[PDB]
Symmetry: C7
Subunit: 267 residues, 7 copies
């Protein structure tokens, strides 16, 4: 014998975008009037390239950061549960131990030989699954919920800290020594969809309020940390090296909810 | 206690085709009157072949591009969520380290020998899944949603940038040196269904409008980028090489929705 | 508050068979009166054998072709969505790089030796799934929807274009050199069920019509392309070779739908 | 606003058995009065053994055959869809290409050697799934639906056509040379459940009739084809060889359906 | 507009146990009044051990046998469908063919050698799944339904017919030569749960009766076949050998169903 | 048209705990008034350690035992079905047979050699799944249902009967020769959760009673069998050996059900 | 015919956080008035780093501990079932035994040799799944339910007890010898999400109370055990070693439930 009052609003600002889509609950048997909100937005990657014959520079997003802040004026409302949350990672382990025995019979020009062979074997394999981007929940309190989406490594197997005395960091290197700066960066074909184009997020969260509920304020804060990766032609081959955050683009989105009118709005 | 008003319309123009099938929602408990639209269309590949005894030319689609544009006249309506969206790619990693020891006993003509052997092993395997066509979401704002469907590589393992000093790019090469131009291209048997015949798309999107809702306009824009791949007989063997976009076929489809009459129409 | 009016009809003609089973929708909240049709028919393979002591000839279906054509007299009705549709194919890739080091100690008749060994390893595996028959959607417009079901290759790993200087095409060869013509063809045991007996199809499609809807016409067209594969005894062993379409059996089935009476009929 | 009239009947005759369990549909919105029937019966294998010290003979079923025939007196009723139907078989393919390089350092009695090694690797694996009995749909028309269930091969990997100069066909051979005729046949432990005891079938089928519907007749025809496999002791070892159909047991079951009374009966 | 009349009864007799739990159906639209019965009972294994210093004897169940017999007095009622039923077994097959080429360079005391190597590879693997106990349906008629649950082989890979000149049958042998008779049998730890303790069954079956339905009789017959496996100390090592059925415990359970009163009872 | 009367009670006694949560069924169409009970309790492991510099002793649970006893005073009530029950274990078998042929060409100081090589391969692999604790149903009658949960073996691969002349039983040994008694036992990190902390059970069971149903009594009996495993420092290395049951902790819990009042209670 | 009264409350205290979200049940057919509570909270990891050129110190959580305590004043209420609970761990075992035979033919300078080779193979592999954090249920009584979440080992394969004479414990070591103290710790990229940021828990539990139910008290107690892991530069390479609990942060949260008012509150 409860009623549900849906509502939603969205804002863009510079092509970022946040969709705040909420559902209010006025259950009579529940002492506290609760609501739950889904954040189904989008945020660009802005993968940009600058190059020449002997030099390249690809700007790309190393890590995204989305924080949702609640703010009750009377300070009764509190973000209860916040999805997504962290999970214990699993790894497949397998050990083996074998033994092989045998012998042989040989002959070469009226001289017959023969032999015996014994061997022992051991191997410890360890499989597991690694995502191209690790999504860790950084903070989660009564009025804050932060999430980071940070780059792990490429399908090729290169990370931000990779280093080779000759080629430097081989991250995003199409060719060790062939094509020029702008054409030497990895094509969107093989890249992770997160870097190729805008990606993320999907964050849900329930907030419990009293029957008094008049007004509350949620605030969505996107922050994209852009690393600059450069290619320097060292005469014989390409030598890549990765710098970091020259500028970190940031956009906040203020959402206000009215509980008496059962509506959600921007600003 | 809400009502749902379905509606749909379709247009073809030159054998492309777009199916706009929407469902309106007039929920009283929802302050904003929202609708959601599914785009279940079709678009041809137009795989064409031209050849001779010593020359071939297969035109094929390298990448498709579908952009949906909303346009509110009062500018209240805003495309909230847009499916499909990007996902973090997963890769299976597995490392192993073993050690094998043993020995032997031999003899050859009244002379007995024997030996010992020790060995160590290490291997770092990295499995993952690669689609024949990567589907990346390029843009997604308050009035635009672009998606690209670009070619990754063949089951054989060849990409657009593949090169061999002798055979050139072996993409779509049936035989290195046997049959003639027109007959040397890969048969539809082994090809990806996307190139063999028309394929794509499936894009959903919700747009939130106020109670005032009178008129809005959605616009579906298909664009197919056709690469020309040619085969040149270099006396002893075939030498393939891949050019690009000579002409890029494009088709727009204007859909208009009336919210007061609860109907969707073309133009 | 909508009503659904089911209806169905079937025809055989020469043992082919088409089942047109439709469901009409008279939704008041939908401006256009829509219907959806499932095509759950059957079509024979007609695998026939002719042989002798030193000669064989198995006729078999290389590719099936099913096209559904809509035809509105006023030209308001248009086939909206058509199932099945094409899907981006996925392939499993896995690369590995290892290194193994060790040594040994030996002795043979008062002379002790010893050694060291180092080795490096690399392997690039590529797994994927190939169907015995690729089902590609060829065309899909406002009044046409064509589908092809073409033969890929045998479980043994032979295709239509396979060739060996000695045995020729080993497709459907039970024995290289043992049994005679009629008995040398592959038994239905190991064959694909599509060739062993009749198979296919399953094609659904929705067509949107206005409230005016009086009459429409759907037309199912089956076409089976039969390749003739022959075995010629070349004295020492069998030499198989594959010709093509001597005759291509074809059957059309005219279905007419009345929307005012809510019924479907043949002719 | 439709009504469903269930009904069922079963008959045995010699321990075979057929269960005809139907459901009639009197939908007012459907112009044609349709029914659907499930055939959930059973049929024995009759695996029999006859043997001695130096001779054996196991009779077993090579292939089953079930055909369902409809017969309308006015000839209005027609079996629309018939389950099961054939499916395109899938096979997993995987190709790999590697390269391993290295070297060594050796010494034996004041004489130090050393070396280099290079190697290349290629492998084309092809996995797939093979059932012990292939179920192919042979025929399917307006008044007939035939299905065959034929033996493929054993888990050991032997088929009907297997041959070895010494042991002959090793199908169903427990021991090459040890135990006597009757005791030399494979125990029901390792055998396929289809041969060990009676097995099959499960066949569904819908038939569409007009409102006039008075009477129709379905007919279930089982036929079991029994191959005789014999073991002849050739002094040193067992030599098996497989003959075929000495007698093929057959049983028909006439079912009649009354649509005016909404009942199904035998004969 | 039908009614369902549940009912159930159970009996034990010597710790065996049978649960007959039925559900009657009085559907007006169905001409025949049908019922369906589930048999969810239990039956002990009675794994018993007798031993000494140099002798052992473990009694264990080789195969279970459950037969359900129906008996209509007027002979109208007939067991229609009977679960479980047999299924076609599937096996995974995989074939591979490779080729590896290379060479080497060597030197030992002012004498440089070198070489070439070529190799070819082929392998035919066959995987499949084997249950510890094969459940085959032996008979199924109008008034009988028999099922056998027979022992296949151990996880170690030993069957009833295994034989070794020295150790004899190694079935259920904990140690080849260490501990004494009673302590030499395999502990319940590694054994199959079916032999460790009582196990089975689960058999369902539908019987169709006319409206006249007054009385029917079902009869559940359990039979456990116990093989005696003995261990004889042959001085140096253990020599196991397996006899068979000394006594086969059997228990019948008479259930009678009243359809007029809608109840099921024992005796 | 039936009614369901839920009820529950729980008791602890010494930190063991049993949750008896039942649901009664008063169906008018069912002649017998039936109930079903779920047993979702908990029982401690009591893993205790006692040690010194040269001696250790870890007490741990080898096997748990839970028996549920019903007791009707008039003796009408009988435990019908009892979950969990035993299942036939499955094992994956795979056999392979290959053959590799090749040759070589060599030369060392104006003396050219060459060779041929042939090889054959066979391998019989057998995979399966083994739980750390086998759960076998020991007994199941009209008034008793016993279940055992016994230890199989460690992930490392050691069982209760493992023995090594030097280290003895390596079960639960952290180090062969390094740390002292108390610190030498395996940390809860790698241990099975059943031994690390309390675990089990989950047992359901239905009991059928007549309409007369006044009172019945269920009785839950836990029994934990504790094996004492000791470590004795044999000067150079650790020598572990496993004793058994010094004391077996036991706890009974009497539950009584009133069917007239539709309630369940303790004692 | 029952009623459900939801309710919830949350508290933070120092950025920890506990969400107590309960659902009361007032079923008339149930003698005892029961409730069930879900604990969907969050708790920080507080991974802190302190370092220099030749020294590092990363504080991290080794194990979490969550205990829920119930407290009835009249002492009628008792926590019945408590989720999560422990599960028997499964391990995949596989054994293999092969044999390979062959021979060779060689020749080197007018001297032809030849040989035979025989070999035997055995291998016992054991796969299983190990979580980065083992979640064991420590205690569960009538008024207490404790759960531990303890660290197992890294994806690399290092545990708390790992030791190497040279590098010490390689846990969390980015480089053996390259970068300095603060920069030498493992980046959040590769770390387990539990340590990178706050994680856990999710614990449900049902408590059965009588109709009298006036007040009860639940108490959530978080305790995080922080191990200090340090890196000491031993001139040539890094030597890591792991200390333990310097301080163990702890936070309790008192929740009180009123059953007469059907509400849950903090303190």
């Amino acid at each position: 014998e409860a009623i549900k009052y849906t509502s939603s609003d969205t804002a863009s600002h510079k092509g970022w975008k946040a969709t705040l889509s909420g559902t209010f609950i006025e259950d009579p048997h529940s002492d506290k009037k609760t609501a739950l909100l889904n954040l189904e937005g989008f945020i660009p990657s802005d993968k940009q390239i600058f190059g020449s014959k002997y030099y390249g520079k690809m700007k790309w997003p190393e890590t995204y950061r989305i924080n949702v802040k609640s703010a009750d004026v009377n300070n009764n409302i509190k973000i209860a549960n916040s999805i997504p949350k962290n999970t214990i990672d699993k790894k497949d382990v397998s050990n083996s131990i074998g033994y092989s025995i045998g012998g042989n019979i040989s002959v070469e020009g009226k001289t017959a030989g023969a032999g015996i062979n014994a061997s022992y074997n051991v191997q410890n394999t360890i499989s597991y699954e690694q995502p191209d981007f690790r999504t860790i929940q950084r903070k989660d309190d009564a009025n804050l919920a932060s999430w980071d989406i940070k780059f792990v490594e490429t399908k090729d197997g290169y990370n931000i800290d990779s280093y080779h005395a000759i080629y430097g960091n081989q991250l995003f290197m199409k060719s060790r020594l062939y094509n020029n700066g702008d054409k030497n960066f990895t094509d969107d074909r093989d890249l992770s969809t997160l870097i190729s184009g805008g990606f993320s997020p999907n964050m849900a969260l329930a907030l419990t309020a009293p029957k008094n509920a008049k007004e509350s304020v949620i605030i969505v804060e996107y922050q994209r940390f852009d690393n600059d990766y450069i290619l320097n032609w060292e005469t014989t081959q390409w030598r890549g090296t990765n710098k970091l955050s020259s500028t970190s683009e940031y956009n906040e989105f203020m959402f206000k909810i009215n509980w008496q009118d059962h509506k959600i709005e921007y600003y």
